[PDB]
């Protein structure tokens, strides 16, 4: 596979790259349209707030490019949230890429601590290939206070105070709310599954 991590220039890239290289794949880091559009598989990382991330995407001339991508793309955590229509702040509503018809909102966890942080299981839509060979009771590592509600785009659900989307898909755009690069063997297999689609 020709693998490209879209160069948002954030701190998560090296850990993502490491996880992919450990699986035997060479990784290219680029924001060049030709290089990106030639890839077989794309990763979209991110950290911080949606406002800063959308600002970063704009300044790096990546808004229109991400929208043009036709091959499978995996957004991780904030990378996933950027695919949706909008995101709250905690304040203004931040307009995101709008590639998935979902919104990102603050989790209402009651007396439960924020962020949703730690190791949790997910409940997968029957037979989705992203989770092939991963047991239902496997743990992924989450660290997020905002989330996308369950909707038509949801391919894995998680429950923490309220149900939310642990993973999503819209055509070639995939997203995970947890960090597979920090989720040990379960996360490694999900990354491998994505690369093997």
Swiss-Prot record:
Cysteines joined through disulfide linkages: none
EC number: 4.3.2.10, 3.5.1.2
NCBIfam families: IMP_synth_hisH (TIGR01855)
Classification via Pfam families: GATase
Localization terms from the record: Cytoplasm
Entry keyword annotation includes Coiled coil: no
Pathway(s) annotated for this protein in UniProt: Amino-acid biosynthesis; L-histidine biosynthesis; L-histidine from 5-phospho-alpha-D-ribose 1-diphosphate: step 5/9
GO terms classed as biological process: L-histidine biosynthetic process
Keywords carried by this UniProt record: Amino-acid biosynthesis, Cytoplasm, Glutamine amidotransferase, Histidine biosynthesis, Hydrolase, Lyase
Name of the protein in question: Imidazole glycerol phosphate synthase subunit HisH
PANTHER family with a match to the protein in the record: IMIDAZOLE GLYCEROL PHOSPHATE SYNTHASE SUBUNIT HISH
SUPFAM superfamilies: Class I glutamine amidotransferase-like
GO MF annotation: an example: lyase activity
UniProt domain Glutamine amidotransferase type-1: residue ranges: 2-197
Active site residues of this protein: 77, 179, 181
Example of a GO cellular component annotation carried by this entry: cytoplasm
InterPro entries, alphabetized: Class_I_gatase-like, GATASE, Imidazole-glycPsynth_HisH
Reactions accelerated catalytically: 5-[(5-phospho-1-deoxy-D-ribulos-1-ylimino)methylamino]-1-(5-phospho-beta-D-ribosyl)imidazole-4-carboxamide + L-glutamine = D-erythro-1-(imidazol-4-yl)glycerol 3-phosphate + 5-amino-1-(5-phospho-beta-D-ribosyl)imidazole-4-carboxamide + L-glutamate + H(+); L-glutamine + H2O = L-glutamate + NH4(+)
Gene: hisH
Record keyword Nucleotide-binding present: no
Subunit structure: Heterodimer of HisH and HisF.
């Amino acid at each position: 596979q020709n693998v490209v991590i879209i160069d948002t220039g954030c701190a998560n890239i090296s850990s993502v790259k490491f996880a992919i290289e450990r699986l035997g794949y060479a990784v290219t880091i680029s924001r060049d349209p030709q290089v990106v559009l030639a890839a077989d598989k794309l990763f979209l990382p991110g950290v911080g707030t949606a406002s800063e991330a959308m600002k970063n995407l704009t300044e790096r001339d990546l808004i229109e490019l991400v929208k043009r991508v036709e091959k499978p793309l995996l957004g991780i955590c904030l990378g996933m949230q950027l695919l949706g229509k909008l995101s709250e702040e905690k304040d203004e509503i931040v307009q995101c890429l709008g590639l998935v018809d979902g919104e990102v909102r603050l989790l209402q966890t009651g007396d439960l601590p924020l962020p949703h942080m730690g190791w949790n299981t997910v409940q997968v839509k029957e037979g989705h290939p992203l989770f092939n060979g991963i047991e239902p009771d496997a743990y992924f590592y989450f660290v997020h206070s905002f989330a996308m509600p369950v909707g038509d785009y949801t391919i894995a659900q998680c429950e923490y105070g309220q149900p939310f989307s642990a993973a999503i898909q819209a055509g070639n755009y995939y997203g995970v709310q947890f960090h597979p690069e920090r989720s040990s063997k379960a996360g490694a297999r999900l990354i491998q599954n994505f690369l093997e689609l």
